[PDB]
Amino acid sequence: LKQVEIFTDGSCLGNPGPGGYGAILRYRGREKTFSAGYTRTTNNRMALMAAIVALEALKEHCEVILSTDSQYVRQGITQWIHNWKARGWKTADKKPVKNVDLWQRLDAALGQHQIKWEWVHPENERCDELARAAAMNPTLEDTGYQVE
């Protein structure tokens, strides 16, 4: 299957506050760029978005090496995402899980490809800049964010 590399990064001026994401999809040379800024969001939601958008842009089952420094994403993937699904997406108290709208989208995207996560670079530097640039020029509302 096609081999591709994805780089991502989220950024937020507050918690919550204006934020943005930056992601890069690379296929043997070619490179696709993604970024958007939201008026009020969190670094966590932006970190997920960056991964979600790049992955959903894929049009076939791919072998993906996904790089992200978000420890929030790292946890969900290596720990929470498993339990959540085995409970109809609910916390330990049968209560809804935060950012379920994004975690579900990320979970769906993961089921589409064979993902190898790199929890760690010149490539990620651009994403950081795209994300910061988006956070400084928000153009959309992050409806999925539940205030406070």
UniProtKB/Swiss-Prot annotation:
Binds 1 Mg(2+) ion per subunit in the absence of substrate. Requires millimolar levels of Mg(2+) for maximal activity. Has low activity at micromolar concentrations of Mn(2+) and is inhibited at higher Mn(2+) levels. Can bind a second metal ion at a regulatory site, or after substrate binding. GO terms for molecular function: endonuclease activity; magnesium ion binding; nucleic acid binding; RNA-DNA hybrid ribonuclease activity. Coiled coil: none annotated. It is found in: Cytoplasm. Mg(2+) 1 binds at D9, A47, D69. One of its GO terms (biological process) is DNA replication, removal of RNA primer. GO terms for cellular component: cytoplasm. Mg(2+) 2 binds at D9, D128. It holds the Pfam family RNase_H. It comes from the Bacteria. PROSITE patterns: RNASE_H_1. Residues 1-136 form the RNase H type-1 domain. Its cofactor is Mg(2+). Keywords: Cytoplasm, Endonuclease, Hydrolase, Magnesium, Metal-binding, Nuclease. Signal peptide: none annotated. Changing D69N: Loss of activity. Monomer. This is Ribonuclease HI. It comes from Escherichia coli (strain K12). The lineage of its organism: Bacteria, Pseudomonadati, Pseudomonadota, Gammaproteobacteria, Enterobacterales.
